[PDB]
Amino acid sequence: VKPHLRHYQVVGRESPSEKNPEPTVYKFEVFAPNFVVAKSRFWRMMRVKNKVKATHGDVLSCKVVKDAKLVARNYLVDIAYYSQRCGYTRMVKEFRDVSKTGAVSQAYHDLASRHRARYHNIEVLNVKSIPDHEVKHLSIAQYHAPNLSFPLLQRRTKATRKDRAIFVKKNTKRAVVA
Template sequence: MGRFTEYSVIGRTLPTENTPEPKLYRMRIFAPNEVVAKSRYWYYLRQLKKAKKANGEIVAINVIHEKKPLKVKNFAIWLRYDSRSGTHNMVKEFRALSRAEAVEAMYQDMAARHRARFRNVQILRVAEIEKKEDIRRPYIKQLLEPGLKFPLPHRRTKSKAWYAANRPVSGFHPIHSSHDYMLPGLKLVYPISNKMMNVLYWVNGLIKAVD
């Protein structure tokens, strides 16, 4: 799946004579687009409230944006997934900028470690861990140490350049290429290459010869 977005989906069953005003059910769904978000909404609602898409409707679907997208936060995700041998519950911790990025990292981790597909993972709860003492995973704790430093294992040093990369100019040019170059009715204020400068000198000589 692609990058995930957090959606707030609100739906209900269709009104009937017995229930003219049915209840509204809201869910926070993580999905790559609105189509998948609606599909997952009806998947959960069918299991929880015995409501089908054929007998229901989506009232509203909105995108939930992160309040502080530039702050790195620690998240805990409670999930349930179906493996080849059974159903398992687990809690995972991630460090990300938003809830959607943490969920995306969770799906990547589940696919790598447990071969879990997107359809086999059910997110139960996503919460931000505000206190440092509440973090339990060592791979998250090691990133919270003060004065944290990272090694530079592959540093490629460059030797001093003994030869010039540009073609040398043997002639004397009183006007530097980065300065202004004056021609009758023309003023250049941007850098000029040596080849272009020679052309301008040649044109200037022709103009003087004609005059």
């Protein structure tokens, strides 16, 4: 399935005024389901860092950063999340994926399952593709073997939806109730 988060680049600034006639222009990287969530994350970042509110600023661009060609890669995702018990927890994780968006989307699922962290409590500091020789985790490095092979065991293969049946003769494929 395709990743549920897209790579957005938001460009914006404080609206010019008499005090600030030439405001600084900021470029922001964020992974969001849509550009409305992307703009919301941008103004939150602007408010908590540059002390600039959305009501006093404008967005120059909210385009999507296109994914590269799909190649099996190692992605180093710098990610952090907030919990009441422990404040902010920042971790660096390695993932196998074919795109930056897929790696970040897989990172959000990983944080949601292993640490019960939802989207709005999570900040993605950085994501990048790294070579095989800089991978530290063995669970990721095992996929760099020049001759990596494995069988497919314990696999539940479902029939085509059109051809699924409720009752089938025991040692045959003839459908009795379908």
